[PDB]
Amino acid sequence: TACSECVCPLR
Amino acid sequence: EEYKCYCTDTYSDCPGFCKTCKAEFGKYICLDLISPNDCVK
């Protein structure tokens, strides 16, 4: 259940 | 999106999902890196 603000820009 | 991804949402305390809580400017900041699916949103 990660946070609602997941950051994953650019593999 | 296409990788472990890192949670960086802000909070008022260290979240169980982000044992590494960074209290800055009064709020918190997650610095974790994991993604069992992709994103919770």
Domain boundaries, chain B: 1-41
Query: Look-up: residue for tokens 């960086």?
Result: B8
CA dist., res. B11 & res. B33, Å (int): 17
Cβ separation B3–A8 shorter than 8 A: yes
CA dist., res. B25 & res. B4, Å (int): 27
* Amino acid, res. B5: C
CA dist., res. B4 & res. A11, Å (int): 9
Q: Which CATH number is B1-41 given?
A: 2.10.69.10
Residue pair B6/B31 in contact (Cβ under 8 Å)? The answer is yes
Residue pair B32/B6 in contact (Cβ under 8 Å)? The answer is yes
E-strand ranges in B1-41 read 6-7
Residue pair B23/B31 in contact (Cβ under 8 Å)? The answer is no
CA dist., res. B41 & res. B20, Å (int): 21
Taking CB atoms and an 8 Å cutoff, what residues of chain B touch A7?
Answer: 5-8
Residue pair B28/B22 in contact (Cβ under 8 Å)? The answer is yes
